[PDB]
Amino acid sequence: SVAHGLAWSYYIGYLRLILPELQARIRTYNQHYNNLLRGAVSQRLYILLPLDCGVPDNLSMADPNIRFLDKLPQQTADRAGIKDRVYSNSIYELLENGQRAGTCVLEYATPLQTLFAMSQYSQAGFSREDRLEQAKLFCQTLEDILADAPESQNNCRLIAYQEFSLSQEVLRHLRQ
Amino acid sequence: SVAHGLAWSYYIGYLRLILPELQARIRTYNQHYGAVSQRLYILLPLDCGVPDNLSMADPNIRFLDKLPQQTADRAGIKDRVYSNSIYELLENGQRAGTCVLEYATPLQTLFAMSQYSQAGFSREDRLEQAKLFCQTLEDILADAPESQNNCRLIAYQEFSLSQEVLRHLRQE
Numbered sequence: 001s002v003a004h005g006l007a008w009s010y011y012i013g014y015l016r017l018i019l020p021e022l023q024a025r026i027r028t029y030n031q032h033y034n035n036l037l038r039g040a041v042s043q044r045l046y047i048l049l050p051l052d053c054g055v056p057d058n059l060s061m062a063d064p065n066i067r068f069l070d071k072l073p074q075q076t077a078d079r080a081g082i083k084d085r086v087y088s089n090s091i092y093e094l095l096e097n098g099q100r101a102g103t104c105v106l107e108y109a110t111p112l113q114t115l116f117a118m119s120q121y122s123q124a125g126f127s128r129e130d131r132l133e134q135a136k137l138f139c140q141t142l143e144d145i146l147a148d149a150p151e152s153q154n155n156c157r158l159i160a161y162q163e164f165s166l167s168q169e170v171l172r173h174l175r176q
Numbered sequence: 177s178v179a180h181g182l183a184w185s186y187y188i189g190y191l192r193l194i195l196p197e198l199q200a201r202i203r204t205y206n207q208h209y210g211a212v213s214q215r216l217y218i219l220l221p222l223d224c225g226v227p228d229n230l231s232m233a234d235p236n237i238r239f240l241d242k243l244p245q246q247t248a249d250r251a252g253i254k255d256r257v258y259s260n261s262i263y264e265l266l267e268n269g270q271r272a273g274t275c276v277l278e279y280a281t282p283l284q285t286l287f288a289m290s291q292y293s294q295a296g297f298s299r300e301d302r303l304e305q306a307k308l309f310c311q312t313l314e315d316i317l318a319d320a321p322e323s324q325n326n327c328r329l330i331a332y333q334e335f336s337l338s339q340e341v342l343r344h345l346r347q348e
């Protein structure tokens with residue numbers, strides 16, 4: 001299946017490589033780069049899983065209550081012949097009634113945009129109406145893989161949703 | 177199919193985003209500094225063996241430099257960095273070529289899936305999946321001119337990896 005392969009690849013090709021190094025990057029930010037007066041950035045990568053497969057590039061566009069704070073210090077690694085392949089991640093403030101309710105590392109699972117694009121291109125042999133079932137299968141496969149990887153599971157949170165306040169969706173997970 | 181999805185995702189999620197900007201990065205590198213050839217040379221090992229160091233696979237493939245990085249806001253990641261590496265290709269102690277080179281990382285997903293019981297993917301099906309990944313990628317690129325002329329697909333089964341790359345480089 002398409003979504004089955006995409007979830008395994010998202011784990012093998014990305015999550016497996018960044019999640020064991022994420023805690024140290026967040027700790028480094030909180031100790032040396034975070035504004036001295038501010039609350040600590042929460043641990044864990046918060047992964048946005050829009051079931052409609054809509055993956056925008058700017059988060060403040062999806063919700064003005066999601067405001068860009070800072071980039072986490074970059075991770076580098078030699079990867080498949082790419083010397084010092086760079087992994088960059090962004091920190092966001094979550095506003096509730098004009099005030100800071102949370103601070104976290106946040107991004108969309110980019111393979112969901114592949115499902116969106118495939119549903120549009122005739123050559124992909126992927127019907128438009130197959131998108132939702134494939135997005136749910138991508139999320140379920142990712143949950144199943146993470147359940148067998150505790151250093152990856154405890155370093156991330158899966159935020160699956162169907163449309164709305166995206167910041168309230170993230171805050172509900174953060175407050176747990 | 178697993179490989180069909182991987183090839184579409186490798187194109188949508190990566191190649192489509194770096195290949196229209198690649199020529200300008202190579203030109204910028206060549207003008208500061210014998211020229212690095214155009215096009216991203218994509219290694220497609222059908223055995224799905226994806227090592228992290230290229231000089232390990234072949235000592236005639238020597239790291240020269242990193243191309244200037246590309247940055248873009250991508251899915252909530254501000255200034256998502258795309259870094260690529262330049263390699264010298266040696267032949268009988270002489271530099272015979274210079275190119276931007278890397279492995280197609282989804283091939284390592286096929287390798288890992290054939291290793292993990294929970295993936296439900298057999299080692300006996302891996303070669304057919306690696307070939308399908310390569311064929312799907314070729315078909316996609318045939319419909320994306322700006323991506324097709326900015327890359328070269330190097331599919332092989334094991335050996336001299338530098339001679340494999342040089343054979344493709346000498347066709348232009």
Ligand SMILES: COc1cc2cc(C(=O)CCC(=O)O)sc2cc1OCCCOc1c(OC)cc2sc(C(=O)CCC(=O)O)cc2c1F
Binds near residue numbers: 006
């Ligand atoms: C190797 O496989 C994958 C690598 C991978 C890397 C990712 C990221 O860096 C997240 C941010 C982003 O997508 O820009 S998501 C991701 C998903 C992957 O598997 C899904 C199937 C292949 O599709 C993709 C992809 O889909 C969205 C994104 C990328 S980004 C990428 C590279 O940057 C190449 C070098 C590297 O793999 O680290 C390859 C792929 C890719 F093959």
